[PDB]
């Protein structure tokens, strides 16, 4: 009944960014239906070609080229291109080839046959010199055509047909440059998408784990890594068997009275459909084929964006050309203006969506152990006695407590699972202090001397022919901090193992007890060890801090770190593809404000804008850095450990202090995402009032909060209202001039 | 031009809240309050004896107060050492207690014709004109000698239900616990006081040579004649020994320079003042001026007051058998709270005066002219509710409910309701009917209209300055 997080979350953001997509393009849409009722030039158009050719023709120009896409004209007016008439050819040609070959018109005779020689209207150059300034002289007739440079082939025709075809033909690519005079509505593009998208992720799902009996291909080895053979296989088959029921639904989609109408509907249950599968099947995953599982979804994604599209495209061009043999293939600004601001924010739409994806994978990618954790530390806690623990202020009931309640738990018949003896450290510092005048203690910590660097004997200082027994134990690179009330201690310290055995902690205890060697001066002692739980595969590092501030008086205190012990060297763990990912959206940041920095010159401070993009990639910087660094120290204090296992300790801490602080950053990064999302809500006309009226009113709210705490912590503020006050204010008179 | 005004002015300001604070950074430590609190607190927790624990609140009785009175009543102060009595080293016997009674005498009235053999002891309320001098008992010694209280180096009583005059007895203790023991046990074996004391006030000085600062005592004890008695117990840190070290030095020239200031302030006002417009006070915002004059006054007069008291109290200290007369500089904790609320109005004063270059962050609170007055009218009737609802549940309450036992503390209990602090574990099994009808009209009425009714007030106000500086 385990539920695995990786599935659900992929799912949930395609439907999210599914839903927005069409929410975008839904008006798109209807901006493109208003539309559908410069790279040329506006040159001159006294153009009287049209002469004893009595008849209502129309005429049709393609600007062809590349990047290039022009709808025919018409004739409109009180003459409208009438019996021996002429016209002026003056539209707006919304793409245009540049200094290239574009030139492509035809007539049709809507009426009879036009008897005339219409040459060119010569544009030279008025805006942007799309095309030359010549003429043709081609003599009108019945469906005359003419095109060329600045028939029947079957050369060109299909070079004309690819082009004409080559990026509304690939459904990836061709939500963003729909041609008008178009049936397939670019709605539907998105519906389409997103169904293959969910058609990949339920195949690769079912194929995982689900289903194999064969010959064993799936099963012990589980090697996440690309071998060649293991992933890209998987992710192939998986989009060659996805489109027999794709093309049927593209093909019903396209050309026929009111089947398409609940196309979308068995759309939407297919995709529904395949969905549910995936977060049913999505329970059996262990965490390490998850990780493969994506990554086979991510290459099929990417065969059938990078050779599964052109082939389809090149195969329909080829029918549409060889069989059926068809020929046939003021506010303007603003709208322009509009249209190209949402394909902006439609492109931006899609980098946020990956980018929240990676930092939920990221964050919750793991996040069934975080109960487990908790669990396991109330456990460790409750069994210390740690109320028990910290209640004891003299420096010699210690010894009874840790002789009953702490010997009977390290050791014991099975007694809690344990990965290490336990440690016993000291700190003297040899700048002895004196008893302080009697009442409350000074709590700011004092007699702050030199550092232990010396060694002792047994008692104290009495060499005889070797150096001292008991060495400082010098501190290693890791480190510790345990940052105590008085000062900020070290690993350095004198070291004790407590023995081996039960017995032997007893003797050993006793016989060390009976010597003083920490009862005078003991600034710190500390006590540390390793709790490994194999049932949840989570360890623990507990430390038990005890400080003597005073000579006399002595304060404990206690901290158990859980954490999940997960090396690099492991393979190709999902934090380790998580985090290196985010390294490349840092890098990708880092490089887009840098091409606006020197784009836009100098003075780019004290702009919000400006600031608040370093700030993300710093983040991210350090959320990438700290992963790794955490995974190096685990793997590195693991072997560290298991070439010593049965007489070394390792001091585990760094990796328990490491693991939160990742986790803090990660948390904080998605914290930080979720509030420009709530920024992104101000696009609905009746609801963008609120963000900018605190826009509005947060500089002098805090003025006047600073004002008030500098003539002061009282509640005056939020005691009974003043912020409504200001707000209500602001709010009318901004609503007002919105209406 | 139209700026020094503003600046020169504002500096000055600045400069001389900064100095303030600078001098009562080291006057006073930041635990004063909890220091005083728990001093206040921990004043009435005499036990009784060995056979009975009859408490001050828990003797009230006829052997009740017999075991109170019979055992460590006079013992707290002297401690067997481990001659001389300390209690933790910091308080060694070094001086004595003292002990100050007031009374008044009876049969100045005449009884009713009626009850003419059924009242005798009919005596009124104590007054001046009320004052005897009257010795009872046996004279035996010098403790019932009579002397006024100018002679004796003292002062008046100002008690809660009795402000009694300088007349009456007074007791001093001893410097070791052999001799007080017995003297105690002497005392107690006949009568010792009568039932017409007035006040009584028990003053104690003790060296505390653990940090060098006086440190005085007082207990006040008034019993009028309408019934019940008011007892009350306070402390106060006297400063008289305050030289120690170049910080008392410091704190001198702070205070030199201080009163320099306000010499110079005050010539400059009169400078300004008959060559000016005098007899003025039409502005509404020079009264912020004349306040802080006064204030500075208070705290000049304060410090002479303090050097005199220190000046007196330099004659003390003759002999090593008496105590440290302390009776007349007991205004310094008082005196220095005054002196840290003078720097606090002297810092907002200079806040006021350079908020004037904020562009429109501190223009929106500049609404004291706009609201001259125009809000005491809310505060009289809050806290005429308030008074309301303070009178009904002292009357319906105070029996059995072990909080409302009086006015001055039922007010804090109503505003701790009101900050959150409600208890309603007494109030239910008190009174089950009209007890939760007080709570809920109590809560209806406080958070919903009067609390409600306060934000409008000031909103109306910011929308109408708001309008004349837009308009304007």
Known sequence: ADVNYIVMLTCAVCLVTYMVMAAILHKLDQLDASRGRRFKYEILVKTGWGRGSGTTAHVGIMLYGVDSRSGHRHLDGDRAFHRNSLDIFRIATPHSLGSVWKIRVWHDNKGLSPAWFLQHVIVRDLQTARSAFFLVNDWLSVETEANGGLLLRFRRLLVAELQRGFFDKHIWLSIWDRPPRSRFTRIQRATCCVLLICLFLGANAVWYGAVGDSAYSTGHVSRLSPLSVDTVAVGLVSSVVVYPVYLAILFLFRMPAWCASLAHGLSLLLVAVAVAVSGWVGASFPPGVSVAWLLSSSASFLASFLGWEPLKVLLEALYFSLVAKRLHPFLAKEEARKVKRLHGMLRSLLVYMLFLLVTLLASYGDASCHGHAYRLQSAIKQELHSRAFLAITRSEELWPWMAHVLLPYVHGNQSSPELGPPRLRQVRLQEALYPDPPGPRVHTCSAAGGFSTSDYDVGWESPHNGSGTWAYSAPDLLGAWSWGSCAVYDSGGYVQELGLSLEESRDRLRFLQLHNWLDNRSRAVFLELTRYSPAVGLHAAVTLRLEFPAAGRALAALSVRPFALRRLSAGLSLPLLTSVCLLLFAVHFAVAEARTWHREGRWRVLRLGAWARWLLVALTAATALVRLAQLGAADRQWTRFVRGRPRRFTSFDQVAQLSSAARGLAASLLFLLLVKAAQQLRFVRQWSVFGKTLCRALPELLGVTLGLVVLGALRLWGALRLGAVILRWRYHALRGELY | ?472
């Not at chain 2, 005491?376 to 549940?393: D, E, P, S, V």
Request: net charge neutral; proline share 2%; charged share 20%.
């Open chain 2, 1 to 472: 031009k139209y700026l020094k005004s503003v600046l020169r002015e504002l500096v000055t300001y600045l400069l001389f809240l900064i100095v303030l604070c600078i001098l009562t950074y080291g006057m006073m430590s930041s635990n004063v309050y909890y220091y005083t609190r728990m001093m206040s607190q921990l004043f009435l927790d005499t036990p009784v004896s060995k056979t009975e624990k009859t408490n001050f609140k828990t003797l009230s009785s006829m052997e009740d107060f017999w075991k109170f009175t019979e055992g460590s009543l006079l013992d707290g102060l002297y401690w067997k050492m481990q001659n001389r009595s300390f209690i933790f080293y910091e308080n060694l016997l070094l001086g004595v207690p003292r002990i100050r009674q007031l009374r008044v005498r009876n049969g100045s009235c005449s009884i009713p014709q009626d009850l003419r053999d059924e009242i005798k002891e009919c005596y009124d309320v104590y007054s001046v004109s009320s004052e005897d001098r009257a010795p009872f008992g046996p004279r035996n010694g010098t403790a019932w000698i009579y002397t006024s209280e100018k002679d004796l180096n003292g002062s008046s009583h100002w008690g809660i239900i009795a402000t009694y005059s300088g007349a009456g007895y007074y007791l001093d203790l001893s410097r070791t616990r052999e001799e007080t023991a017995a003297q105690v046990a002497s005392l107690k074996k006949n009568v010792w006081l009568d039932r017409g004391t007035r006040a009584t006030f028990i003053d104690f000085s003790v060296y505390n040579a653990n940090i060098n600062l006086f440190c005085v005592v007082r207990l006040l004890v008034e019993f009028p004649a309408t019934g019940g008695v008011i007892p009350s117990w306070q402390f106060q840190p006297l400063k008289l020994i305050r030289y120690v070290t170049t910080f008392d030095f410091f704190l001198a020239a702070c205070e030199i320079i201080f009163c320099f200031f306000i010499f110079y302030y005050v010539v400059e006002e009169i400078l300004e003042i008959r060559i000016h417009k005098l007899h003025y006070f039409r502005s509404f915002w020079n009264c912020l001026d004349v306040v802080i004059v006064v204030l500075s006054v208070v705290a000049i007069g304060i410090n002479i007051y303090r050097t005199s008291n220190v000046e007196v109290l330099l004659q003390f200290l003759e002999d090593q058998n008496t105590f440290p007369n302390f009776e007349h500089l007991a205004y310094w904790q008082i005196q220095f709270n005054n002196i840290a609320a003078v720097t606090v109005f002297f810092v907002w004063i200079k806040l006021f005066k350079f908020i004037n270059f904020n562009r429109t962050m501190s223009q929106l609170s500049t609404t004291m002219s706009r609201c001259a007055k125009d809000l005491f009218g809310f505060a009289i009737m809050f806290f005429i509710i308030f008074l309301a609802y303070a009178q009904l549940a002292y009357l319906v309450f105070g029996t059995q409910v072990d909080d409302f036992s009086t006015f001055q503390e039922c007010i804090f209990t109503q505003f701790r309701i009101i900050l959150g602090d409600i208890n309603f574990a007494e109030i239910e099994e008190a009174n089950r009917v009209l007890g939760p009808i007080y709570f809920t009209t109590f809560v209806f009425f406080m958070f919903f209209i009067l609390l409600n009714m306060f934000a409008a007030i000031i909103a109306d106000t910011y929308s109408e300055v708001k309008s004349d500086l837009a308009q304007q």
